[PDB]
Ligand binder design. Structure first.
Ligand SMILES: O=C(c1cncc2ccccc12)N1CCN(c2ccccc2)CC1
Ligand SMILES: O=C(c1cncc2ccccc12)N1CCN(c2ccccc2)CC1
Lengths: 304, 304
């Protein structure tokens, strides 16, 4: 028992982190096979932050201007290209530590682990969710760009995020590994609206199921509700509308606990309307939405 | 900016995880140099859980009864011995992935990362604190024994915890890497009192400093207090008494924010007496105590 915001083991990703420098700018890159992937804003200067012409900036750069270091050893760059907001630096050596991998564009509400890095060196690992508004609530400082988010399925690393920027509001934005930003964000030092962030209802319910499995049952009530009645409450509290697809995804947790999904919805409706009354659930005083139903089953089953 | 419960990158520890089986019992071991460390209760059966005589049980075991597997390959056991509550299995091969390491017995209130493992395979990584009552609030299932807690200082892994058991209350207990339990716990399937768990005051203050650094300042007030006045409040709320050593440790955070430690104490006193009033601090609705002042400086400075 016990429920923690667990991240995937980061070893397979640590073995891919390299440092990329262009001019005076240093950030992190991801070395997979003979390619190093990094945010294209590595080619920017102080005067090229508010409105960069990446195509024009990149034209002034040659292979030897991109310094890539893996640990203490220098990688030789034999090609460079821009794919959306990422640069792909072809190096003469395939990463010997390259794990089995995939590039995936995750759905909002899905979770992933982030390996925060500085100067190509890993500093820490944490679990987070892609918010419905396509931002992440990470922990990133200057130099963390190019740090990646990923999921692990047995031996395969699915890379889903590359860190590009911090919005003036302290939230984070970035791209998939094809360089396409999640959300409406652009790699420019301008004010950008993140948008209203809703609560991932299916994740809150999954966490309530985790709470029941882990002994926390005070919030369970004698009520039930309907999807339409529940959603009237969810709308009022800026919660994502729950659909039959979400109910179906909660099926295994509903079967394990013996609590019907609409019954758990009535517990959630009462918690929203009444608050926690100074009480806690899984060591938390607010409703947690950064655990998917898959994360709950995984943590409560011991998938390695 | 952003503040997350960050764990150390786990790669160096993943490379040390092995599976140990004795009879019908399988758990995890830690392979460092030519020794595999594991909980001694691996030699127990169902009838040897309530009151095991480890010395007598171990006498019926020979080297070939300990099956150690590193990935898919079998390790040859050439020696075995019991040191307190851990077994040390000497194998004929030194772990080629052995990192620079230390065995340390951590102080209550200090934090560490746990790499939860099953069958010698890592499942996840999370950060936790050694509670003042010498328990940990982990996430562990059957088969997780032998999973370890550690800290990383540049390239050196300081192992501080080995998982041994779950108390009937859902909290976790275990040993340092010399096999000495943290707290009064014994490796027996009997009811064991954990003791009153207090809140790590110096950690709550460190987290309040992290909140200020990360923009959350609503809780800051126009008041100050004294160590003795603060401790009268801390006692009432089952908080550890704050000492000058704790004030001195908060010195760098006090200097970075320009907020005197006793001024932050008055903010903490008011939060304890008045509650959060439905507000949050660093995405939390309760006062967080599992970040040390060192963790706050590290996360807010980017130590790799
Ligand atoms: O290293 C960072 C950064 C990232 N994440 C969190 C942070 C927190 C505080 C300070 C800086 C950061 N930046 C910020 C984006 N930046 C950039 C440059 C050109 C075009 C678009 C973006 C490059 C430098
Ligand atoms: O694998 C575990 C375990 C550990 N952590 C969390 C758990 C949650 C649910 C179920 C089991 C566990 N045990 C529990 C202790 N156990 C043991 C045997 C002899 C003497 C002393 C301890 C060996 C088997």
């Amino acid at each position: 028992s016990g429920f923690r915001k667990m991240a995937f083991p980061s070893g397979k990703v640590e073995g891919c982190m390299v440092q990329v420098t262009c001019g005076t700018t240093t950030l992190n890159g991801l070395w997979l096979d003979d390619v190093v992937y990094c945010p294209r804003h590595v080619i920017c200067t102080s005067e090229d932050m508010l409105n960069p012409n990446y195509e024009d900036l990149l034209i002034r750069k040659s292979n030897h201007n991109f310094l890539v270091q893996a640990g203490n050893v220098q990688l030789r760059v034999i090609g460079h290209s821009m794919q959306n907001c990422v640069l792909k630096l072809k190096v003469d050596t395939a990463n010997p530590k390259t794990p089995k991998y995939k590039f995936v564009r995750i759905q909002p509400g899905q979770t992933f682990s982030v390996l925060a890095c500085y100067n190509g060196s890993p500093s820490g690992v944490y679990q987070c969710a892609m918010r419905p508004n396509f931002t992440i609530k990470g922990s990133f400082l200057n130099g963390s760009c190019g740090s990646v988010g990923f999921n692990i399925d047995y031996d395969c690393v699915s890379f889903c995020y590359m860190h590009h920027m911090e919005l003036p509001t302290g939230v984070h934005a970035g791209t998939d590994l094809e360089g396409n930003f999640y959300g409406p964000f652009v790699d420019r030092q301008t004010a950008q609206a993140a948008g209203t962030d809703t609560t991932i209802t299916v994740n809150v319910l999954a966490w309530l199921y985790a709470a029941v499995i882990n002994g926390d049952r005070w919030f369970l009530n004698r009520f039930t509700t309907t999807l339409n009645d529940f959603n009237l409450v969810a709308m009022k509290y800026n919660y994502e509308p729950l659909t039959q697809d979400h109910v179906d995804i909660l099926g295994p947790l509903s079967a394990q606990t013996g609590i019907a999904v609409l019954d758990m919805c009535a517990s959630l409706k009462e918690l929203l309307q009444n608050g926690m009354n100074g009480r806690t659930i899984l060591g938390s005083a607010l409703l947690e939405d950064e655990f998917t139903p898959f994360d709950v089953v995984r943590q409560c089953s011991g998938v390695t």
